[PDB]
A paper describes a structure:
Crystals obtained after reductively alkylating the truncated Rab3218-201:GDP:GtgE21-214,C45A-complex and the full-length complex Rab321-225:GDP:GtgE1-228,C45A diffracted up to 2.3 Å and 2.9 Å resolution, respectively. The average B-factor of the full-length complex is higher than for the truncated complex, though the entire electron density is well defined for both structures. Due to the higher resolution, the truncated Rab3218-201:GDP:GtgE21-214,C45A-complex is discussed only and referred to as Rab32:GDP:GtgEC45A hereafter. In the complex structure, GtgE can be envisioned as a trident poking into Rab32 with three spike-like protrusions. Spike 2 is represented by the β2G–β3G loop (where subscript G denotes GtgE), and penetrates deeply into the switch I–switch II cleft of Rab32. Thereby, spike 1 and 2 form intimate interactions with the switch I structure that is also the site of proteolytic cleavage. The shallow cleft between spike 2 and 3 is filled by the switch II region of Rab32. In particular, the N-terminus (amino acids 23–45), including the position of the active sitecysteine (here the C45A substitution) is now resolved, in addition to the loop regions β2G-β3G (i.e., spike 2) and α4G-β6G (i.e., spike 3). The complex interface buries an average solvent exposed surface area of 1535 Å2, as determined with the ‘Protein interfaces, surfaces and assemblies’ web service (PISA). The switch I residue I58R forms the center of a hydrophobic cluster and interacts with W46G, L81G, C86G, I141G, L150G, and I202G, whereas D61R from the protease recognition sequence forms a specific interaction with the guanidinium group of R142G. The interacting polar network between the catalytic triad, C45G, H151G, and D169G, is formed in the Rab32:GDP:GtgEC45A-complex once C45G is modeled to the active site cysteine nucleophile.
Residue numbers in the entry:
A (entry chain B): 22 to 147, 162 to 195
B (entry chain A): 23 to 213
The structure:
């Protein structure tokens, strides 16, 4: 009845990773999210169906976004991933493969298969097979496809 | 060897469906309580405190810096055994000599200063996080961690705890509002 899924949100700096989490978890959007002392990750609870409750942990890569290397204490036990880039910047889309490759080197399904990974084309208000289970044109400012991309990821996680 | 006895508090609610930003009060309650009881931080959390039981944000960083001084929560003194670990944390290396120095550093601090509170950048969030080092086991090479994000105390490997310390002491991850990051301890504890 109750499931706990840890999902990583990775990508380059300034693409909307923190904003996407804040929009989906807290229905909030802004350009400056100040820092406090409170949590190690975000939580979203979903009434997936009448017989299933899904607790979704959203781990913002945060301070590790400028360096692009993943530590075990961050990625351990991950079952899904969002790879986010900015469509208004060409260089941010280039490093999607560098994040996807680093992701594929650290975490994996119990059977060895790659974890479900969704590509997020953020700032959509303003295909190639590399291992992604899907893709969505999301917008943290306009709240577009962010909720669909989460259910799309949770569905692929529940398939396994 | 050295295992302290403190009450664990989760910053989740009873059902685990609500996540509060209560890492600051939970960690403060760990290092101040004794013998499996709960410290009286109710005067700070209940009195119209927006930072308590808040699902969005925690306590302000500068406001928490002043709160630690009021409750006699002190930073561990800059000793030579601490400086060697801090230099190793700058290089992000965990070889045998560093791991042995880490084992003696944690053992010494837990014996003489009791449980430690670690304030560090969050692993999966833009904010800061607080957790507690309450015990150590040299046989399995693990540390007893009181992390309010979990449902119970957890025995974590030394290198995983070492990577958590790296966030608080390496200049790569320290922001301009990370002046509160570091290891703290209860100023009234004595072995
Ligand atoms: N218009 C628009 N702006 C966005 C969107 N997502 C993020 N931003 C802006 O991008 C800036 C940086 O995004 P940020 O949350 O820091 O992304 P992060 O660095 O990956 O965590 C913020 O000031 C946001 O206002 C979006 O969907 N639409
Ligand atoms: Mg961010």
């Amino acid at each position: 009845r109750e499931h706990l899924f840890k999902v990583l949100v990775i990508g380059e700096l300034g693409v909307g990773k923190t904003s996407i989490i804040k929009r989906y978890v807290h229905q909030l959007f802004s350009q400056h999210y100040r820092a406090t002392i409170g949590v190690d990750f975000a939580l979203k609870v979903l009434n997936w169906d009448s017989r299933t409750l899904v607790r979704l942990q959203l781990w913002d890569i945060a301070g590790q976004e400028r360096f692009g290397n993943m530590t075990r204490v961050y990625y351990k036990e991950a079952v899904g991933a969002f790879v986010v880039f900015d469509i208004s910047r060409s260089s941010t889309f280039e490093a999607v493969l560098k994040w996807k490759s680093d992701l594929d080197s650290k975490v994996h399904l119990p059977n060895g298969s790659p974890i479900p990974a969704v590509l997020l084309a953020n700032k959509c208000d303003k295909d190639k097979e590399h291992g992604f289970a899907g893709w969505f044109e999301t917008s943290a400012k306009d709240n577009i496809n962010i909720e669909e991309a989460a259910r799309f990821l949770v569905e692929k996680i529940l398939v396994n | 060897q050295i295992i302290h006895h403190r009450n664990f508090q989760s910053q989740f609610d009873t059902t685990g469906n609500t996540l509060y930003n209560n890492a600051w009060v939970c960690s403060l309650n760990v290092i101040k309580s004794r013998d499996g009881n709960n410290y009286s931080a109710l005067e700070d959390i209940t009195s119209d405190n927006q930072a308590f039981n808040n699902i969005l944000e925690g306590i302000d960083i500068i406001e928490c810096e002043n709160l630690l001084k009021e409750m006699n929560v002190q930073k561990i003194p800059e000793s030579s055994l601490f400086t060697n670990i801090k230099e190793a944390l700058q290089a992000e290396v965990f070889n045998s000599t560093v791991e042995d120095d880490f084992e003696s550093f944690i053992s010494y601090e837990l014996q003489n200063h009791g449980p430690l509170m670690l304030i560090r950048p969050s692993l999966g969030s833009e904010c800061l996080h607080a957790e507690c080092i309450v015990g150590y086991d040299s046989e399995v090479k693990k540390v007893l961690i009181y992390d309010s994000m979990n449902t119970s105390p957890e025995w974590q490997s030394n290198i995983d705890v070492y990577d958590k310390l790296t966030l608080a002491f390496n200049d790569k991850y320290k922001n301009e509002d990370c002046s509160i990051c570091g290891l703290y301890y209860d100023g009234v504890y004595e072995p």
